[PDB]
Design an enzyme around this catalytic site. Structure first.
Site, PDB file in Angstrom:
ATOM      1  N   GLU A   5       5.229   2.895   1.391  1.00 35.57           N
ATOM      2  CA  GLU A   5       6.531   2.627   1.996  1.00 35.57           C
ATOM      3  C   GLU A   5       7.361   3.875   2.280  1.00 35.57           C
ATOM      4  O   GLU A   5       7.275   4.873   1.570  1.00 35.57           O
ATOM      5  CB  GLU A   5       7.364   1.631   1.167  1.00 35.57           C
ATOM      6  N   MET A  22       0.809  -1.222   0.000  1.00 36.15           N
ATOM      7  CA  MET A  22       0.000   0.000   0.000  1.00 36.15           C
ATOM      8  C   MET A  22       0.847   1.281   0.000  1.00 36.15           C
ATOM      9  O   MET A  22       0.372   2.322  -0.427  1.00 36.15           O
ATOM     10  CB  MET A  22      -0.951   0.025   1.214  1.00 36.15           C
ATOM     11  N   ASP A  30       8.673  14.327  12.424  1.00 30.85           N
ATOM     12  CA  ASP A  30       8.509  13.829  11.067  1.00 30.85           C
ATOM     13  C   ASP A  30       7.131  14.187  10.481  1.00 30.85           C
ATOM     14  O   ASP A  30       6.519  13.392   9.797  1.00 30.85           O
ATOM     15  CB  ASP A  30       8.790  12.307  11.009  1.00 30.85           C
ATOM     16  N   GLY A  88      10.468   1.179   6.446  1.00 35.57           N
ATOM     17  CA  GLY A  88       9.675  -0.023   6.207  1.00 35.57           C
ATOM     18  C   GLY A  88       8.621   0.089   5.122  1.00 35.57           C
ATOM     19  O   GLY A  88       8.430   1.163   4.545  1.00 35.57           O
ATOM     20  N   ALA A 121       2.633  12.629   3.975  1.00 30.47           N
ATOM     21  CA  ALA A 121       2.683  11.163   3.878  1.00 30.47           C
ATOM     22  C   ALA A 121       2.330  10.509   5.250  1.00 30.47           C
ATOM     23  O   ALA A 121       1.779   9.393   5.299  1.00 30.47           O
ATOM     24  CB  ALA A 121       4.063  10.719   3.425  1.00 30.47           C
TER      25      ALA A 121
HETATM   26  C1  LIG Z   1      -7.557   4.729  -1.927  1.00 33.01           C
HETATM   27  C2  LIG Z   1      -7.005   3.420  -1.389  1.00 33.01           C
HETATM   28  C3  LIG Z   1      -6.052   2.799  -2.396  1.00 33.01           C
HETATM   29  O1  LIG Z   1      -8.123   2.519  -1.217  1.00 33.01           O
HETATM   30  C4  LIG Z   1      -6.345   3.623   0.009  1.00 33.01           C
HETATM   31  F1  LIG Z   1      -5.473   4.709  -0.043  1.00 33.01           F
HETATM   32  C5  LIG Z   1      -5.566   2.418   0.474  1.00 33.01           C
HETATM   33  N1  LIG Z   1      -5.116   2.621   1.833  1.00 33.01           N
HETATM   34  C6  LIG Z   1      -3.850   2.902   2.138  1.00 33.01           C
HETATM   35  O2  LIG Z   1      -3.007   3.193   1.298  1.00 33.01           O
HETATM   36  C7  LIG Z   1      -3.518   2.827   3.592  1.00 33.01           C
HETATM   37  C8  LIG Z   1      -4.327   2.122   4.485  1.00 33.01           C
HETATM   38  N2  LIG Z   1      -4.073   1.975   5.786  1.00 33.01           N
HETATM   39  C9  LIG Z   1      -2.972   2.549   6.263  1.00 33.01           C
HETATM   40  N3  LIG Z   1      -2.784   2.326   7.600  1.00 33.01           N
HETATM   41  C10 LIG Z   1      -1.746   2.772   8.412  1.00 33.01           C
HETATM   42  C11 LIG Z   1      -2.066   3.326   9.651  1.00 33.01           C
HETATM   43  C12 LIG Z   1      -1.072   3.791  10.498  1.00 33.01           C
HETATM   44  C13 LIG Z   1       0.262   3.703  10.107  1.00 33.01           C
HETATM   45  N4  LIG Z   1       1.382   4.120  10.836  1.00 33.01           N
HETATM   46  C14 LIG Z   1       2.460   3.876  10.176  1.00 33.01           C
HETATM   47  S1  LIG Z   1       2.280   3.136   8.626  1.00 33.01           S
HETATM   48  C15 LIG Z   1       0.568   3.140   8.865  1.00 33.01           C
HETATM   49  C16 LIG Z   1      -0.418   2.671   8.007  1.00 33.01           C
HETATM   50  C17 LIG Z   1      -2.091   3.295   5.467  1.00 33.01           C
HETATM   51  C18 LIG Z   1      -2.358   3.441   4.106  1.00 33.01           C
HETATM   52  N5  LIG Z   1      -1.510   4.138   3.260  1.00 33.01           N
HETATM   53  C19 LIG Z   1      -0.263   4.769   3.674  1.00 33.01           C
HETATM   54  C20 LIG Z   1       0.895   4.698   2.753  1.00 33.01           C
HETATM   55  C21 LIG Z   1       0.883   3.891   3.992  1.00 33.01           C
END
Ligand SMILES: CC(C)(O)[C@H](F)CNC(=O)c1cnc(Nc2ccc3ncsc3c2)cc1NC1CC1
Ligand SMILES: CC(C)(O)[C@H](F)CNC(=O)c1cnc(Nc2ccc3ncsc3c2)cc1NC1CC1
Ligand SMILES: CC(C)(O)[C@H](F)CNC(=O)c1cnc(Nc2ccc3ncsc3c2)cc1NC1CC1
Ligand SMILES: CC(C)(O)[C@H](F)CNC(=O)c1cnc(Nc2ccc3ncsc3c2)cc1NC1CC1
Lengths: 289, 287, 287, 286
Positions: free
Chosen positions: B31, B29, B143, B35, B147
């Site tokens: 990076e 999803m 940070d 990580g 993003a």
């Molecule tokens: C629009 C679409 C593609 O459905 C949606 F955007 C998909 N969801 C995600 O991309 C997406 C979904 N859940 C995430 N959860 C999340 C929550 C907390 C956290 N703390 C550190 S990493 C991290 C990641 C991040 C996402 N994207 C971020 C790039 C990582």
């Protein structure tokens, strides 16, 4: 050879809220503009219309010649991939042209998501190219050279049917003393002064590149400022087409993106006689899908 | 406080950490430098698994993320569900954010519709409340960037990435300078650690929200979004010339009130910058 | 004898051996009537429509009548015959491919086409009127005027089609009664043959254009579009209550001028109906 | 959650004094129900929808307060957003974000000449409407008026559940409310249960498949619910009813959607699937 509705300038000033310069998104009438005039939304008898109010780096008799050329080509050419002229206004120094309203504006604005429109899908940009090549084919079949093929000049209806527009610069299918068009899309020979249907193919090649990358042909605040330069970077193995594909899509596949890029690179041959005919470009886009 | 997961459970729920993008049919999803984030399914629940990749420095960031997550719980702060520390594979499990990050939504990554001015205001307000809770609980993010501002099912802004977080509330120094150059305050680039640097990074985030442009673009003139602030200050350009064209509801009054907050935040001199409670007050007064 | 003489095996190649699958499902079938099936084809770079006809001497008489009328009549609102294939018991007719199919399918948005606008409907109706006029001027009675028989080209120019039932006009009778019940004049249902019956069938076509409803619908109340004319005449309903909702540019002034032409065409008493030159004049005054 | 408090005279300005002319003609009226008329408006540069409630007066006030109370609690991407309201005098107005593609009802019927929705879009719309109803049932709320007119579509065709004036906290009633054409049998005799919402959604899946509205006065049969009986008794198939105004529909996923609809339209309320199961089936279909 069709006749159009003759409007009086005051009716067009009423239907366009006195040519309100505010954007339609805000609550006004202005929908777009070029170097030869400004497009306004209007309502003529329950019909939503687009009124292009022509305005001046060109002469008054030059702007009148473009108004008469637009009308003369519209009378002759009628196609589903060509926009339709409804009427016009010529009384006084105010030349207006009335068209059917395109619910999705131009391909330029849709690729840039102007006013917050959702990004076009690969599948949709594919149908838009096919439509615009079917449009550019009808023009060439009826011995006409557009002389201004660009994404701002490709309009999208309710279903996203591509309708090519702006025939003020159109020629009957030589050289010229008044070099016209948009630099970012113009063929090398067209920048000199040559007039040929081969130049239209080149301008369409730049349009296929805009569709693939989502980037406009020229961006002042971008490196490189010309989308054509990116073709050179790919040819010299310095970059790939996969590195430039619009990230604002999720349905683009490599096989069809490289087939569309192949058509575009054929259209962008710097030597006019190496470029394909509009019937060959139309055949390649149909084979791509 | 958090569920203790085994590395084997997360290898199953993330299709063995499929690097293919979710749009193509994979699990990746997003990076960062610390990580890669993968989509997962833990019993009908969609989750996000961040597989971390100095060794003791990466372990310190994993322990810091967990320690700050245990303390701080807010509506504008993302929620940690669990973690995996077994072996040399560090994983962190969070709730799945249906709308990903503010960075990807401003750029319409994967074809998402452009955010409107109205949602952009809700996101700025939320991210300010989120920074406020962190500063109230004596923590410096270190940070802050688009993003790291995540968007849930309702587009609620939720600050993420607390591996670099520090305990506030004066100004100290460091040997390991960390963060993202495009958003970092001048003193942060020099090694200072202060909650004032977070305000500066948030000023760059307000500029990203207004213009739709990322803080740094290699193939753009100017390459830094901060430079655009100088062009406006020297009357060479206006904020109206930079407002994101991908939105139909933005108005001058509220765009200049948001630009005022951003300009105040972007003071090259840290003590001239407003506190997070003043930034939070200004964003609330804007609407 | 002024058209291209094709062999049946050439047409088998150009139509993928007469693929019965619909063009939407990847095949060649585009439509069909009681006298045959229409297939998409390619005769080099030109897209064509091949109608494979399916009494044997009666079907041969219709094939010869279509060709004989097409040889005589050439007009912009009359569809063009390119060629034919009469070798063996397989009668084929080749025409220009109409990119927009029939008026019937466009009014119903078959295959997901966008709804026709009032402005396009007005040109279609005027064109169909101009076409019928040329036929009546050249002493021919169509005998099968209906929206399925009004085809639409690349510019939505109405092109009248199906001349297998055309007759060489005065009042005579027949022992074989042909046409489509939902459009047929009262006297034509009784066996009479007169150009006045074509005017009546065109009145039902003007009603189809106004309402977007087909002349007959089994699962509709009322099942006949003609019944709706009675409801309007008895002040029980107005034409404004029946105007197609799938249009945004329809205006009362023009819709009632088109309904006036339709009401005049739909006289049960044949001699009270207007001539095709008067119908053409009224549709030319409407715009 | 606090919403903007507007004065009636302020919203009067933004809606051109509630112009009854249709937006297609050049006016402000966009639609209307039994409880009010929806008008297009502009609040600054924000295009809005102002629903001016009109007739039971204390009942209409209870619906206005219920809409606001549920909108305060529930915020989701597949739930429409309340911006503000006006309660001064006997003129209750509610202000929402403008949905560029109106309602699912009007898009299935191509009202105002919109192009027919494709099978692919109809699928995403069904999934969106399932997720929106799922959030409601997760937050212990019963819509009580699930129908295609109440499923709105934004610029990207994201489906949004609308009209929460009749919503209940998740029994029987003396004021039976809803739209007859979609209402569950138990709901027609006063019962209040989240399974009635599943039934109303089953009728919505049928509308999506056939392009026909749940009730049509000038149609045989007048009820879309009757067509389910014709299919059950082998008298007709779902292939005979699939919307002809789409070219991208395939039998396999159309019968998978009809399966979900048939499960939703069960005689026994307890035999119907939960919204999480309906949501799972609609995700497995694509
Ligand atoms: C629009 C679409 C593609 O459905 C949606 F955007 C998909 N969801 C995600 O991309 C997406 C979904 N859940 C995430 N959860 C999340 C929550 C907390 C956290 N703390 C550190 S990493 C991290 C990641 C991040 C996402 N994207 C971020 C790039 C990582
Ligand atoms: C998405 C949105 C804003 O609703 C939609 F884009 C609004 N519609 C239009 O913008 C838009 C609508 N109709 C247009 N009609 C039109 C047709 C032919 C033609 N030939 C010369 S000028 C000209 C204008 C152009 C539009 N936009 C063009 C850029 C001017
Ligand atoms: C919208 C879409 C799918 O592109 C369009 F529908 C395709 N076009 C056609 O189907 C379609 C195309 N060309 C046709 N040509 C044609 C010309 C003269 C003639 N005389 C007797 S039969 C006959 C057929 C008919 C079409 N459809 C008619 C129903 C048969
Ligand atoms: C296609 C077209 C005509 O541009 C578009 F449909 C215009 N937009 C609308 O009609 C249309 C636009 N926004 C709406 N917003 C909205 C949001 C929530 C809500 N909750 C209760 S009422 C209500 C209304 C409804 C619309 N239409 C519905 C029929 C009322």
């Amino acid at each position: 050879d069709t006749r159009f509705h003759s409007f009086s300038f005051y009716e067009l000033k009423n239907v366009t809220n006195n040519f309100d310069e505010r954007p339609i998104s805000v609550g006004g009438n202005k929908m777009g503009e070029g170097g030869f005039g400004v497009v306004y939304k209007g309502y003529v008898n329950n019909t939503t219309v687009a009124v292009k109010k022509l305005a001046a780096d060109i002469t008054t008799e030059e702007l009148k010649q473009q108004f008469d050329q637009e009308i003369k080509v519209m009378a002759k050419c009628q196609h589903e991939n060509l926009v339709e002229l409804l009427g016009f206004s010529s009384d006084g120094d105010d030349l207006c042209l009335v068209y059917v309203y395109m619910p999705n504006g131009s391909l330029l604005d849709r690729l840039s998501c102007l006013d917050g429109t959702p990004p076009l899908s690969w599948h949709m940009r594919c149908k838009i190219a096919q439509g615009a090549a079917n449009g550019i084919n009808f023009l060439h079949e009826n011995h006409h050279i557009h002389r201004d093929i660009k994404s701002a000049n490709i309009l999208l209806d309710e279903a996203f049917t591509a309708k090519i527009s702006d025939f003020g610069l159109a020629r009957a299918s030589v050289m010229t003393s008044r070099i016209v068009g948009t630099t970012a899309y113009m063929a090398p020979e067209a920048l000199r002064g040559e007039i040929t249907p081969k130049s239209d193919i080149y301008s369409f090649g730049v349009v296929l590149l805009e569709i693939i990358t989502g980037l406009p042909a020229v961006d002042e605040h971008r490196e490189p400022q010309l989308l054509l330069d990116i073709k050179e970077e790919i040819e010299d193995e310095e970059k790939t087409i996969e590195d430039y594909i619009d990230k604002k899509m999720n349905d683009a596949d490599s096989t069809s993106v490289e087939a569309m890029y192949s058509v575009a690179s054929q259209c962008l041959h710097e030597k006019k006689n190496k470029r394909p005919d509009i019937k060959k470009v139309q055949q390649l886009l149909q084979e791509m899908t």
